[PDB]
Amino acid sequence: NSSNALQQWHHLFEATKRSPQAQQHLQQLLRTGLPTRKHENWKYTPLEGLINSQFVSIAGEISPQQRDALALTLDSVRLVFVDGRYVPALSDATEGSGYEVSINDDRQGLPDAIQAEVFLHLTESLAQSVTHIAVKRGQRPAKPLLLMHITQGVAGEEVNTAHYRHHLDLAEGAEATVIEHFVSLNDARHFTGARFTINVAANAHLQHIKLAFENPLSHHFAHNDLLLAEDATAFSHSFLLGGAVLRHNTSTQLNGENSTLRINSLAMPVKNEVCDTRTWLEHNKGFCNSRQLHKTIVSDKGRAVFNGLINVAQHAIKTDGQMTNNNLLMGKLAEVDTKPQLEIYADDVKCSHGATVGRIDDEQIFYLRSRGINQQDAQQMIIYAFAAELTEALRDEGLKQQVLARIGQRLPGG
Amino acid sequence: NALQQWHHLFEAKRSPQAQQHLQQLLRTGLPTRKHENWKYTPLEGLINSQFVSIAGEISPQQRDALALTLDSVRLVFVDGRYVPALSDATEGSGYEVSINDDRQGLPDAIQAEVFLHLTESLAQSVTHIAVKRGQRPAKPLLLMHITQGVAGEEVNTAHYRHHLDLAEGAEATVIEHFVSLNDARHFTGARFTINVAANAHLQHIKLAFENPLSHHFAHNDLLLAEDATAFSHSFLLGGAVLRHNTSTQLNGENSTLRINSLAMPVKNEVCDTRTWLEHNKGFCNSRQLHKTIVSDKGRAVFNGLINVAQHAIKTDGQMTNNNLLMGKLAEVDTKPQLEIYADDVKCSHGATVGRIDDEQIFYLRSRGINQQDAQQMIIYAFAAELTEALRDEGLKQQVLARIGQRLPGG
C-alpha cells in the first residue's frame, strides 16, 4: 500500500547521517504523502509498480570495464556515480578543468525548491551527498561536464533505489554545457531518483542535456530546477528513452529581465511503458523570451504524458512565451494525455501554446513509398524527421549519433 | 453553511431524482481553491451568504421591458417557476411541451459536479420539450429567465431545469435568455440537457445577461447520436461570477459539433467557461472557439477537456481559445486537457494571450480614427467570428449591443 512505500523510504532515511536540510524534506515528504489517481497531477501516471514493492538501498562497485561498456563516447570532464554514490576512482580529475567540484553533504547554500512535490522531497531526503559544481565569473570550460549515473537492481523481487543530487552555479558571464547520463548496469529493475538544480547568473549561458537511458523495467523520478537572473541564457534538452515508468520535471524561474530560455524534451514509450515529461515556468520579470518544444512518439501499449504550466506574473511586460507539444501515435493501442496550461497576469505579452495528436498520415508515407522505400524505412525516416528539431540541438556530432542510435532502438524494425 | 442552507431549501414533494442529486451534493461537498477545477473561480462571495427562495410575480410590461426583440415561441420563467400567464402557447407550435416534475425519462449526467447536483435538486419543475420526427418548427424556441434579488443582505436563489429531445430528422433552434429584474443580487442555477437523435440538427444559443452583482452557475449536456449536427453558441455577459459548463457526448458516427463561447469580464468579475467533450464513436468532427476580452481587474477562466475513446478512428477535433487582455490588472487562466486513445485521428488545441498592439492604435490615430473608435473596431473584429454565427440579424444586433456595454466608452 501507499503508506508501506512511505514507511520503507522513511526506514531507509533513518537507516547514515542526514543533514538538517534532508530532515526538512523528509518532514515535507510525510506531510505531502503519496497521491492517488484522483490527484490533479497524477491521473495518468501509475505508481502501483513502485508502491507495491519492497525496497533496498545497496551501493555496489563496478570496474572501469563495466563503466566503459555503458559509457558515451565523448571528450568530457566525466564524474561517475554508482548506486547513489560518487566514485573517485572512476572519475576524471577536475582541477584546472574550469569546473570547481566538491562532493559532500553540506547543504547550507542550496536554494529553495521552485515547485515542491513528493518525489522531489524523496530525492532530497535520501540522497547521501550533493555534487557542488561551480564555474567562476567569465569562465568557459573547454570540455562539457558529464555526470554519468550507473544504477543496478538486485536479484530477486526487491527493488534497489538510488537518489542523486547535484547543484551547479554558473557565475556571471560563465558559459558551460552539462550532460546528465543515466544507465542501468543490467536488466534488474531499480528505482532511480534524481535532482539537478542550476543557478544561472547575469550574462551566463547554460546548455543542459539529459539522457535518461535506463533499462525497460526501472522507475525514474526526477525534478530539476533552473533559476535564471537577468541577461541570462539557458537551454535544456531531455531525451527520455529508458525505464518502464519515468516522470521528469523541469521547474524554472525567470527572476531577471532580458533572459532567454528554451526547454525541450523527447519521449518515446513502447511496450507498456509510461513516459511523463513535465515543466513549470514562472516569468517573474518581464522582457524574457521562452520557447518549449516537447515531442512524443508512442508505440504499442505505451502512454506519453505531457504537463506544462506557464505563469506570467503581474507587470512582467514584454514576456514572449511559447509552448508546443506534438504527439505521434503509432498503433491502435497507444495513448497520450496532454495538459499545456497558462496563468497570465500581464497584458503586454505574447503567450501561446499548442498541442497536436495524430499518426503518420498515409499521404506523407505515400511519397516515400512511391520512390520504392519500404514501409519500415519510410516510417523511420518520418520519425527521425519528426524528432530532428530536437536532435539537431545537439552540437557534438558524435553525441548526436549516439542519441539517434538510442532513438533507433524504439523505431519500427529497430 | 451553504450546504446546510441549500439542504433546507430542498426540504422546504421532491422527486426521487432530485433527492438523489441532493444526496450526491452533500456527499461531494463544496470544493476549495486546491481542487483541480477550482483554482481560479472564487466561491467566497457566494458561500458566505444567506439564501432564500422567493417566487416573485411579474407583469407583462416588466417582461416586455427585459425581453429580446424576436419572433419566437417564448416560454417565460420567473424566480425558478414557469409562468403560463406570460408565456406563449406551445400547443400547435411545432414543439411538444409538458411542464411538470416527472424526471424518469431524463438521461444520466455526462459529467457530475457540485453545481449540477444543486440545480437538479432545487429545480421546482422540468420543462419537457420535444420536436417530433422529421419536423422543423417555424419559429425558434425562446426560454426567457427572469430572476430577481430581495432587499437586504439575503441572496435569492432560483434553479432552472429544461430538457429538449430532437427526434430523428428533427431540426430546431433554441435560445436561453437570462436577465435580472433589477440591481439586486441573486444566485441563478441552470441546467439545459439536450438529446439529438440520428439525423437531427440542433442550434443552441445561450445569452447570460444578468446584472453585475449576481452569480450564475450552469451545466448543459448535449448528447448526439449518428449523422447528427449540433452548434452551441454562448454569450456570457452578465453576473459578478459566472461559471458555465457544456458537457457533450458524441455517441454516433458521422456527426458534427461546434461549441463556441464569448466571455468579457470587466470590473472585478470572473467569467469561467468550460467544456467537456467525449468522442465516443469515430468519424465525428468537433470544433470549438472560445474567445475572451478581459478588462482591468477582470478574470477569464477557460477549461476544455477532450477525450477520444479507443477505436474512435477518423476523429477530427479542434479547440481554440484566444484571449485579449485590455489592462495591466487583467487576468486569464486557460487549461485544455487532451486524453487521446486512438491513433487514426486529427486532434489539436491552441491558446493565445495578448493585447492590442499600440502600433495598431497609433496607425489608426494617424489615419483619423481616435482611440475609442479604434479600440471598439478592433474588439468587435475580435468577437466577429463568434457574433457572425447568429443567423437572425435582429438578434445579432442585440447581442452586439450587450457587448458594446463592456467596451471602452460603452
3-state helix/strand/coil string of chain A: CHHHHHHHHHHHHHCCCCCHHHHHHHHHHHHHCCCCCCCCCCCCCCCHHHHCCCEECCCCCCCHHHHHHHCCCCCCEEEEEECCEECHHHCCCCCCCCCEEEEECCCCCCCCCCCCCHHHHHHHHHCCCEEEEEECCCCCCCCCEEEEEEECCCCCCCEEEEEEEEEEEECCCCEEEEEEEEEECCCCCEEEEEEEEEEECCCCEEEEEEEEECCCCCEEEEEEEEEECCCCEEEEEEEECCCCEEEEEEEEEECCCCCEEEEEEEECCCCCCEEEEEEEEEECCCCCEEEEEEEEEECCCCEEEEEEEEEECCCCCCEEEEEEEEEEECCCCCEEEEEEEEEECCCCEEEEEEEEEECCCHHHHHHHHCCCCCHHHHHHHHHHHHHHHHHCCCCCHHHHHHHHHHHHCCCCCC
Q: Rounded distance, CA B172 to CA A200, Å?
A: 61
CA–CA dist B265, B293 (Å, integer):
7
What is the Cα–Cα distance from A265 to B35, expressed in whole angstroms? 28
Residue A243 in contact with residue A273, Cβ under 8 Å?
A: yes
The answer to whether A170 and A206 have CB atoms below 8 angstroms apart is: yes
With 0-12 CB in 10 A as exposed, 13-18 as middle and 19+ as buried, what is A11? exposed
Instruction: Pick B333's closest partner by Cβ from A314, A336, A343.
Output: A343
| CB count in 10 Å sphere of residue B105 | 10
Question: What does the angle CA A310 – CA A315 – CA A319 come to, to the nearest 5 degrees?
Answer: 50
Amino acid at B388: E
Distance from CA of B270 to the nearest CA of A (A): 14
Say if CB B208 and CB B245 are below 8 A apart.
no
Q: Are B223 and B196 in contact (CB under 8 A)?
A: yes
**How many residues are there in chain A?**
414
Instruction: Give the C-alpha distances (Å, rounded to integers) separating A89 from A78, A163, B56.
Output: 11, 20, 86
Name, in order, each residue with C-beta under 8 angstroms of B251's C-beta and a sequence gap of 6 or more: B223, B224, B225, B280, B281
CA gap B172, B137 in Å, rounded: 6
A373 burial level (CB within 10 Å; 0-12, 13-18, 19+):
middle
C-alpha cell at A214: 535506463
- Residue A84 half-sphere exposure toward CB, CA atoms < 13 A: 21
Neighbours of A3 (CB within 10 A): 11
Which of B233, B236, B231, B226 shows the shortest CA–CA distance to B293? B236
AA letter at B280: N
Residue of B nearest to A42 (CA): B36
CA–CA separation, A144 and A67 (whole Å) = 19
Total of domains in chain A = 1
Do B247 and B274 meet the contact criterion of CB atoms below 8 Å apart? no
Hey, what amino acid is at B42?
P
CA torsion sign for A108, A113, A118, A122 is negative
CA distance A279 to A292: 9
Residue B238, beta-bridge partner list? none
Give the integer Cα–Cα distance in Å for A54 and B322: 49
In chain B the first and final C-alpha atoms are separated, in Å, by 39
Which of B333, B337, B347 faces A339 most closely, judged by CB atoms?
Answer: B337
For residues A330 and B132, what is the distance between their CA atoms, to the nearest angstrom?
A: 44
Mutate to test the interface with A, among B341, B361, B379 (most CBs of A within 10 A): B341
Task: Give dist(CA A342, CA A242) in Å, integer.
Answer: 29
CA distance A232 to A206: 8
Residue of B213, B274, B323, B238 whose CA lies nearest to B66: B238
Handedness of CA B110, B317, B270, B35 (dihedral sign): positive
Distances (CA, A) of B87 to A136, B43, B60: 80, 34, 10
Spatial CA neighbour of B53 closest among B230, B221, B188, B209: B188
Residue numbers followed by a gap, chain B, C–N over 2.5 Å: 12
Chain B environment of A345 (Cβ under 8 Å): 331
Report the C-alpha gap between A40 and A38 in whole angstroms.
6
CA distance A84 to A161: 8
Greatest alpha-carbon pair distance for chain A in Å reads: 66
Question: What are the residues whose beta carbons fall under 8 Å from the beta carbon of B302, sequence distance 6 or more?
Answer: B263, B272, B273, B274, B290, B292, B321, B323, B332, B333, B334, B335, B351
Closest among A256, A208, A206 to A231, alpha carbons compared:
A256
Question: What CA–CA distance (Å, rounded) separates A74 from A147?
Answer: 12
The closest of B56, B87, B93 to B74, measured between CA atoms, is: B87
Q: Pick the closest to residue A265 from A306, A217, A224 (CA basis).
A: A306
Between B114-122 and B2-11, two packed helices, what is the crossing angle to 10 degrees? 30
Mutation target for A interface from B338, B346, B348: give the one with most A CBs within 10 A: B338
Backbone torsions φ then ψ of B398, nearest 5 degrees = -65, -40
The grid coordinates listed for A213 are 537511458
Under 8 Å between Cβ of A336 and A329 = yes
d(CA B191, CA B219): 5
Chain B residues contacting A via beta carbons under 8 Å: 35-36, 40, 310-311, 323, 325-355
Q: Which residues contact B318 (CB under 8 A, 6 or more apart)?
A: B286, B287, B288, B347, B348, B349
Length in residues, chain B: 410
Instruction: Please name which of B10, B29, B27, B32 lies closest in space to residue B19, comparing C-alpha atoms.
Output: B10
Torsion of CA A3, A5, A10, A16, to 10 degrees: 170
CA–CA gap between residue A161 and residue B295 (Å, rounded): 52
- Are A327 and B340 an interchain contact pair (Cβ–Cβ within 8 Å)? yes
Cell, residue A375: 514501409
Distance of CA B327 to the CA centre of its chain: 26
Cell numbers given for B114: 457540485
Instruction: Please tell me the distance in Å from B164's CA to the nearest CA on chain A.
Output: 33
Contacts of B333 in chain A (CB under 8 A): 341-344
Q: Which residue's C-alpha cell is 536554494? A: A111
Is the C-alpha dihedral spanning B197, B283, B347, A277 positive or negative?
positive
Q: What is the 3-state secondary structure (H, E, C) of chain B?
A: CHHHHHHHHHHCCCCHHHHHHHHHHHHHCCCCCCCCCCCCCCCHHHHCCCEECCCCCCCHHHHHHHCCCCCCEEEEEECCEECHHHCCCCCCCCCEEEEECCCCCCCCCCCCCHHHHHHHHHCCCEEEEEECCCCCCCCCEEEEEEECCCCCCCEEEEEEEEEEEECCCCEEEEEEEEEECCCCCEEEEEEEEEEECCCCEEEEEEEECCCCCCEEEEEEEEEECCCCEEEEEEEECCCCEEEEEEEEEECCCCCEEEEEEEECCCCCCEEEEEEEEEECCCCCEEEEEEEEEECCCCEEEEEEEEEECCCCCCCEEEEEEEEEECCCCCEEEEEEEEEECCCCCEEEEEEEEECCCHHHHHHHHHCCCCHHHHHHHHHHHHHHHHHCCCCCHHHHHHHHHHHHCCCCCC
* Burial of B198 (C-beta count, 10 Å sphere; 0-12/13-18/19+): middle
CA separation (Å) from A54 to A4, A157, A193, B16?
9, 7, 16, 49
Contact of B228 with B196, CB cutoff 8 Å: yes
The pairing of beta strand A219-228 with beta strand A190-200: parallel
Integer Cα distance of A22 and A125 in angstroms: 4
**Cβ-contact B162, B192 below 8 angstroms:** yes
Determine the Cα–Cα distance for residues A309 and B20; give it in Å rounded to an integer: 38
Q: List CB contacts (< 8 A) between B347 and chain A.
A: 356-358
**Dihedral sign from CA coordinates of A69, A267, A91, A187:** negative
The nearest alpha carbon in chain A to B331 belongs to A345
| HSE toward the beta carbon, residue B24, CA cutoff 13 A | 18
The answer for residues whose C-beta is within 8 angstroms of residue A389's C-beta and 6 or more apart is A293, A295
Helix orientation angle between B358-366 and B371-387, rounded to the nearest 10 degrees: 120
CA-to-CA dists, residue B379 to A235, B235, B300, B373, B403, angstroms:
37, 15, 16, 10, 10
Give residue B119's region: left, alpha or beta (phi > 0; psi -120 to 50). Answer: alpha
Q: Do B354 and A349 touch (CB under 8 A)?
A: yes
Question: For A330, which residue in chain B has the nearest alpha carbon?
Answer: B343
Distance CA B232, CA B95 (A): 19
- A347: containing domain: 1-414
Nearest-angstrom CA–CA distance, B27 and A205: 54
Are the CB atoms for B194 and B225 separated by under 8 Å? no
Distance, in Å, from the CA atom of B116 to the CA atom of B191, rounded to the nearest integer, reads 7
The shortest C-alpha distance from A400 to chain B (Å) reads 29
Select the residue of B310, B333, B338 nearest A338 (Cβ to Cβ).
B338
* B14-19 CB contacts, 8 Å cutoff, 24+ apart: B14/B121, B15/B101, B15/B102, B15/B103, B17/B103, B17/B104, B17/B106, B17/B120, B18/B103, B18/B120, B18/B121, B18/B122, B18/B123, B19/B121
Angle at A296 between CA A248 and CA B281, to 5 degrees: 115
C-alpha cell at A312: 506570467
Sequence-distant (≥ 6) Cβ neighbours of residue A119 within 8 angstroms: A193, A221, A222, A223, A247, A249
* Torsion on CA atoms B55, B58, B64, B67, rounded to nearest 10: -10
Residue with cell 519515468: A246
For residue A79, give the nearest of A71, A88, A70 by alpha carbon: A88
Residue A391 phi, psi dihedral angles, 5° rounding: -75, -25
CA–CA distances in Å: residue B404 to residues A379, B145, B252, B300, B378: 53, 22, 40, 18, 12
- Rg (chain A; Cα; Å): 21
Which value in Å is the resolution of this experimental model? 1.8
Q: Distance between terminal CA atoms of chain A?
A: 38
The shortest C-alpha distance from B41 to chain A (Å) reads 13
Alpha-carbon distance B231 to B389, whole Å?
Answer: 9
Q: Which residues contact A409 (CB under 8 A, 6 or more apart)?
A: none
CB A67 within 8 A of CB A137: no
Contacts for A324 with CB less than 8 Å, ≥ 6 apart: A292, A293, A294, A353, A354, A355
| Cβ proximity of A227 and A256 under 8 Å | no
Instruction: Kindly give the pairing relationship between strand B299-308 and strand B141-147.
Output: unpaired
User: Burial code of A268-277, b = ≥16 C-beta within 10 A, e = fewer?
Assistant: bbbeebbbbb
Distant-in-sequence, close-in-space partners of A413: CB < 8 Å, separation ≥ 6: A376, A377, A379, A380
Determination technique for this entry: X-ray
Record the cell numbers describing residue B80, joined without a space: 425558478
Bridge partners of residue A183, in order along the sequence: A150, A213
- Rounded CA-CA distance B359/B376 in Å is 16
B182 class by beta-carbon count within 10 Å (0-12 exposed, 13-18 middle, 19+ buried): exposed
CA dihedral A328, A329, A330, A334 (to 10 degrees): 150
| CA B188 vs CA B118, B128, B249: distances in Å | 11, 20, 25
